[PDB]
């Protein structure tokens, strides 16, 4: 078995079904005590939670699901009827994510789209009936942050006030994205310094608010 399979099994055996908080705790504990994994983690998770509660987004897009940690984290704070779409290129992780969401009881709030973000983003309007996004969590490969942001704008998916929240802007880092949004009059940016998940290593999130053309 894989590390991802072991994470899911641990959750199933150490958290309570339908209790998102106990799922996060179980993942955090396994990844602290047993095997590191690239979940956004509790340190940065807490800053995400603060952002989510500030904006109360009705429709969130996540880029990069992995084992579903962040999707559980965001979905648990969504208001009734509010939705998350999460894109995941690896089918094994998409399957882990779905199972994680099911265990947590958040499956009716989340749709996991198995495919590349660059292929799926142009389908959101027609195929998934999206108008505009309220928030986007960028947490997939770091070289896609900038191209996918520009694609989101091209496809008419951003509106005035759409909140981009980007993980890992320090480690591994996303230099082209960071310099772009910070230099653009189309974004209002704020940096939230934190720590790499499960490590004493500085990391941070960037919040970039779309201001229109
Ligand atoms: N272009 C792409 N489109 C969709 N998913 C991608 C991608 N490039 C990478 N990924 C996926 O992005 C993930 C990054 S890890 C995501 C962790 C998750 N947000 C959390 O905090 O819990 C991996 O599962 C990887 O397969
Ligand atoms: O949060 C993350 C962390 C790391 C990562 C890996 C190795 C390392 F040494 C440090 C950090 C990689 C990621 C890829 N996609 C999404 N999120 C990531
Ligand atoms: Cl990467
Ligand atoms: Cl952490
Ligand atoms: Mg990350």
Swiss-Prot record:
Cite the ranges annotated as topological domain Extracellular.
1-213
Signal peptide per UniProt: none
Does the keyword field hold Nucleus? Answer: no
For the ligand (Mg(2+)), the binding residues are: 139, 167-168
Task: Write out the GO biological process terms.
Answer: artery development; behavioral fear response; catecholamine catabolic process; catecholamine metabolic process; cellular response to cocaine; cellular response to phosphate starvation; cerebellar cortex morphogenesis; cholesterol efflux
One of the record's GO cellular component terms: cell body
This one is known as: Catechol O-methyltransferase
Question: How, per the record, is the cofactor bound?
Answer: Binds 1 Mg(2+) ion per subunit.
- Annotated GO MF terms: catechol O-methyltransferase activity; magnesium ion binding
Modified after translation how?
Answer: The N-terminus is blocked.
Cofactor(s) for this protein?
Mg(2+)
- Which source organism does the UniProt entry give? Rattus norvegicus (Rat)
Which UniProt keywords are present, listed alphabetically?
Catecholamine metabolism, Cell membrane, Cytoplasm, Lipid metabolism, Magnesium, Membrane, Metal-binding, Methyltransferase, Neurotransmitter degradation, Phosphoprotein, S-adenosyl-L-methionine, Signal-anchor, Transferase, Transmembrane, Transmembrane helix
Q: What does this protein do?
A: Catalyzes the O-methylation, and thereby the inactivation, of catecholamine neurotransmitters and catechol hormones. Also shortens the biological half-lives of certain neuroactive drugs, like L-DOPA, alpha-methyl DOPA and isoproterenol.
| Keyword Transmembrane helix set for record | yes
Q: Which reaction does it catalyse?
A: a catechol + S-adenosyl-L-methionine = a guaiacol + S-adenosyl-L-homocysteine + H(+); 2-hydroxyestrone + S-adenosyl-L-methionine = 2-hydroxy-3-methoxy-estrone + S-adenosyl-L-homocysteine + H(+); 4-hydroxyestrone + S-adenosyl-L-methionine = 4-methoxyestrone + S-adenosyl-L-homocysteine + H(+); 2-hydroxyestrone + S-adenosyl-L-methionine = 2-methoxyestrone + S-adenosyl-L-homocysteine + H(+)
Please specify the portion of the entire protein covered by the chain, as first and last position out of its full length: 46 to 258 of 264
In the Enzyme Commission scheme, what number(s) does this protein have?
2.1.1.6
Q: What class of enzyme is it?
A: transferase
């Amino acid at each position: 078995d894989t590390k991802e399979q072991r994470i899911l099994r641990y959750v199933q055996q150490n958290a309570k079904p339908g209790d998102p908080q106990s799922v996060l705790e179980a993942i955090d504990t396994y990844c602290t005590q047993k095997e590191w994994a690239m979940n956004v983690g509790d340190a940065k998770g807490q800053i995400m939670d603060a952002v989510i509660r500030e904006y109360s987004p009705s429709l969130v897009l996540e880029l990069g699901a992995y084992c579903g940690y962040s999707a559980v984290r965001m979905a648990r704070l969504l208001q009734p009827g509010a939705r998350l779409l999460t894109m995941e290129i690896n089918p094994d992780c998409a399957a882990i994510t779905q199972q994680m969401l099911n265990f947590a009881g958040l499956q009716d709030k989340v749709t996991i789209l198995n495919g590349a973000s660059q292929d799926l983003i142009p389908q959101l309007k027609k195929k998934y009936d999206v108008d505009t996004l309220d928030m986007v969590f960028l947490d997939h490969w770091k070289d896609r942050y900038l191209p996918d942001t520009l694609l989101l704008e091209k496809c008419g998916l951003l509106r005035k006030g759409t909140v981009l929240l980007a993980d890992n802007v320090i480690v591994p880092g996303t230099p082209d994205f960071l310099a772009y949004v910070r230099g653009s009059s189309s974004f209002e940016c704020t940096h939230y310094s934190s720590y790499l998940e499960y490590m004493k290593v500085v990391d941070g999130l960037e919040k970039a608010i779309y201001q229109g053309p």
